Amino acid sequence: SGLVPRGSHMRIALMQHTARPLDPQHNLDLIDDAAARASEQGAQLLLTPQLFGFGYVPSQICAQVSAEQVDAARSRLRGIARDRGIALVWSLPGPEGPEQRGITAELADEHGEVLASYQKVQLYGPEEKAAFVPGEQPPPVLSWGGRQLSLLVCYDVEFPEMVRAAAARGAQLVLVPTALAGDETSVPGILLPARAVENGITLAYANHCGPEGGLVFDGGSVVVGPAGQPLGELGVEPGLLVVDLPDADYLQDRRAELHRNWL
Amino acid sequence: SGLVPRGSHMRIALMQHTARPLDPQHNLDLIDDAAARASEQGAQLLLTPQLFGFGYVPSQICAQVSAEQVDAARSRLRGIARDRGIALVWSLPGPEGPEQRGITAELADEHGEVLASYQKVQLYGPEEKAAFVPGEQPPPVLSWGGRQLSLLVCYDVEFPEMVRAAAARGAQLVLVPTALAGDETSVPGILLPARAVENGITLAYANHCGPEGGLVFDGGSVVVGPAGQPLGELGVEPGLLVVDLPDADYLQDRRAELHRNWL
């Protein structure tokens, strides 16, 4: 949005769109188009929504999507990051067999090489819990573009423990593919701004929108800064949000040694 | 506010007012007046603000308020709960010597007998940290009026770990004397509603207001229900807020055994 400002050195983009269940040719063509568009606007990274490549249909992924088909979508996403020359964060099933995989988020750089991979720890509801194995590792944190970036996926961000875990390892910018349906306004309206304020961090949340898999996704993709203010936000239609990021001490004051015994 | 509705069995009141530093005769007369007023409106419990009886002046409490003077204010508050026949939550320095005490919150029943006592765990800024010893115990949770009540004080509630600690021990209604100054709108505007939503609990937050101890307190006392909605709220003037309480499963889903290693 506009020329790249002085005093920003990171421009990110978020893809909000409707996937077709079980049609990864169509869904990855959409991600390829968003990646081109984001790159034309001078974004360095595009964040895409949870399970976008197969559509958000956990039971049907478990029943019908083989490890080989997930690998093929993964190879094509690595091709898109490389061919459109933009870092990409996507979210696919994990690479193991259908009975042993989780839901993952991955960040690939502008060469197509995956720099960080994270397995969703907090699965939502009985369909996700039956279709995927929850992760057991804390979120990764890595230098990229001048900041420490971290990954979480959809329901994870509603647990202040999960965002606290990223921020305690140095995260400044937490990127969150999501798939939020059913007019759940409290998540982006109440919980995300608190996660940003209570850790002094920025969070980007890229959602589906529209009719998909028997649900109607909320859209509402947003980047929330460390005052809890939206730096940029979309409504309920497909869009590409592009935001330039500018260049109490809860993280120090918290009595973590007591808190960890009280959870 | 109005007759006691059908389908509410708990009416609470919150006192919002300006204390005079180092004048506990005046400040406890104000609490006595609020207690009478709350009881006339059929409230069963009155919540009052942090350190109200001596005023919010941590350095001057450390330097000039003896253990005997704190004990005298404590005895008079127990007299007010008993003589006005209403449970009272107040917040005083702890009962030990000036060098060893913390800041506490206490709940006394309508007989004047203290049912729960809690020592503030998260102290705010260098004056509070120099004047008081932080607590080391989790918040207490107890049946009262048909619900499980818990206590926290001012900055504690800004740590999702502290509210999570109360809710994990069964709290449904968390009562919070506070002393918030400097137009900190993110606390009641962003953080309190998240604490209520992310635990499915109700929180009552009773603040000072006006000119006191070289600060200007925000008022903004509020009761926030488990959707993050204000059930009742005051502005910036002295007032008595009276609220009738009606009669995702984050607390179950959270992976606490991983979270406690990641803090």
UniProtKB/TrEMBL annotation, chains A, B:
Signal peptide: none annotated. It is an enzyme of class 3 (hydrolase). GO terms for biological process: putrescine biosynthetic process from arginine. One of its GO terms (molecular function) is N-carbamoylputrescine amidase activity. It comes from the Bacteria. CDD domains: R-amidase_like. Residues 10-247 form the CN hydrolase domain. PROSITE patterns: CN_HYDROLASE. The modification Cysteine sulfinic acid (-SO2H) is found at residue 62. Its EC number is 3.5.1.4. Keywords: Hydrolase. PANTHER family: BETA-UREIDOPROPIONASE, NITRILASE C965.09-RELATED. This is Amidase. The lineage of its organism: Bacteria, Bacillati, Actinomycetota, Actinomycetes, Micrococcales.
